[PDB]
């Protein structure tokens, strides 16, 4: 209900604020427990990430394998988000280039991986990748923070399902 929804959203802003204050901030499991142990359903837990499709549409083979492939992609997408929150970025942060064989073997190895970068703001389609609109000179810090947290949380929840230790493993075993 209301208290559970409020606790969830407040916990999200506490962590999103820490990311906006420090893009290199690491979070422990205990600091993420408000979100991992929340009794909210999946549609309520992930407001930006289409986590249902990300898991189910890449569920090919043994869960040991495609959860690892998806973990790597989510790990990389998280660092793309942290990169946009860093006050010191590389010069050409405004564009992601797909032709990199490392991009092709990580993010482009799962359906939906590209679309996550769009949630950061990489919205203009290129032949060789995705980029920010040339008018937008700086990224939406709050948006990038929320997506980054969700991408971090999704990888975390997948890892806890991998080790048979998710606090609400029963309900989330459907994925």
């Amino acid at each position: 209900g209301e208290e559970e929804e409020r606790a969830f959203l407040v916990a999200r802003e506490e962590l999103a604020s820490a990311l906006r204050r420090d893009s290199g901030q690491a979070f422990s499991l205990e600091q993420l427990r408000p979100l991992l142990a929340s009794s909210l359903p999946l549609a309520a837990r992930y407001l930006q990430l289409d986590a249902a499709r990300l898991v189910r549409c890449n569920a090919h083979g043994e869960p040991r394998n495609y959860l690892n492939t998806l973990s790597t992609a989510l790990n990389i997408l998280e660092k793309y988000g942290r990169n946009l929150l860093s006050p010191q970025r590389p010069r050409y942060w405004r564009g992601v280039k797909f032709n990199n064989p490392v991009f092709r073997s990580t993010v482009d190895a799962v359906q939906g991986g590209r679309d996550v970068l769009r949630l950061y703001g990489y919205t203009e389609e290129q032949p060789d990748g995705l980029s920010f609109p040339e008018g937008q000179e700086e990224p939406d810090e709050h948006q990038v923070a929320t997506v980054t947290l969700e991408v971090l949380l999704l990888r975390t929840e997948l890892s806890l399902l991998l080790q048979n230790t998710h606090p609400r493993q029963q309900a989330l075993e459907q994925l």
């Binding site: 790990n75 793309y80 590389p90 050409y92 490392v102 073997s105 990580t106």
Partner: peptide, 17 residues
């Protein structure tokens, strides 16, 4: 995070420099 993923990220971070 595993160092193998940091290798991947460093290649992608290079593409942005």
């Amino acid at each position: 995070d595993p160092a193998i993923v940091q290798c991947a990220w460093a290649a992608l971070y290079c593409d942005m420099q």
